[PDB]
Design a protein around this ligand. Structure first.
Ligand SMILES: Nc1ncnc2c1c(-c1ccc(C(=O)Nc3cc(OC(F)(F)F)ccn3)cc1)nn2[C@@H]1CCCN(C(=O)C2CC2)C1
Length: 258
């Protein structure tokens, strides 16, 4: 299956503390560079996650952080993935790399590709945000932590700033809720890691979201690009474009800038 022998891993350095515990860098079998996530005890519904990991393991796409396996025959649980040299996208954006507007749209395309794949498989992310994206040594952005919020053990919140009205009111997660979050993700990229609704608390942001207050147009984003992210914020979920339409629109803008 997808079980990796924990005795075939080696911890060289600790990259930091992500969601669910610490992340290590090391070698798999003494042959492959990999990152190792140590699921902190008591931070996740492990039984449900272990059984669901089989489905998430089979998801294959270049813009999805490639998963190599897990170590569930022990504790803490291990998750072996590829090593993204540049780490989290949020910290990567807040470090100005002298980002060119063409590069910003490039990052949106990377995420939109992975989301279009998850959409084709009817797999919801539920927590799409710059903090959950990773960048490799070549500057490619890949989506991660997809479908994990459903197993988080809680021991308004912050993710409200990325949620649509139907999620804040009825927790009605769907493909259109990922569309809304992706629109906010585009806002973070063109905002260079700026926090959405930084002036309001979590509860205040939810109130303004329920009232219709959309995120403003970032400075580095043209009206052409802002129209794409703005389309993700239709009040009616059924009126929001799919990731196929979003990816198609992003491709049209990139082709014109060529
Ligand atoms: N791969 C990396 N490479 C370089 N750095 C990496 C990382 C990671 C990472 C490692 C594994 C997963 C992970 O398991 N995703 C998953 C599991 C799933 O479950 C299953 F697998 F399907 F079962 C299902 C879906 N996605 C996520 C992320 N985190 N980090 C850094 C950790 C510390 C903070 N940080 C930063 O950037 C700040 C600036 C210092 C990021």
């Amino acid at each position: 299956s997808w079980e990796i022998d924990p005795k075939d891993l080696t911890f060289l350095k600790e990259l930091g503390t992500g969601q669910f515990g610490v992340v290590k860098y090391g070698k798999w079998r003494g042959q492959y560079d990999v990152a190792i996530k140590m699921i902190r005890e008591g931070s996740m519904s492990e039984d449900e996650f272990i059984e669901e990991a089989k489905v998430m393991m089979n998801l294959s796409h270049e813009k999805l952080v490639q998963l190599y396996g897990v170590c569930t025959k022990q504790r803490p649980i291990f998750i072996i993935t590829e090593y993204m040299a540049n780490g989290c996208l949020l910290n990567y954006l807040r470090e100005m790399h002298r980002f060119q507007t063409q590069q910003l749209l490039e990052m949106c395309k990377d995420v939109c590709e992975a989301m279009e794949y998850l959409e084709s498989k009817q797999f919801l992310h539920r927590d799409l945000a710059a903090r959950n994206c990773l960048v490799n040594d070549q500057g490619v952005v890949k989506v991660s932590d997809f479908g994990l919020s459903r197993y988080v053990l809680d021991d308004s919140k912050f993710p409200v700033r990325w949620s649509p009205p139907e999620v804040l009111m009825y927790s009605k997660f769907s493909s259109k809720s990922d569309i809304w979050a992706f629109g906010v993700l585009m806002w973070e990229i063109y905002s260079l890691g700026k926090m959405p609704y930084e002036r309001f608390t979590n509860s205040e942001t939810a109130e303004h979201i329920a009232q219709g207050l959309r995120l403003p147009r970032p400075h580095l984003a043209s009206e052409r690009v802002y129209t794409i992210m703005y389309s993700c914020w239709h009040e009616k979920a059924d009126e929001r474009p799919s990731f196929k339409i979003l990816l198609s629109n992003i491709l049209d803008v990139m082709d014109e800038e060529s």
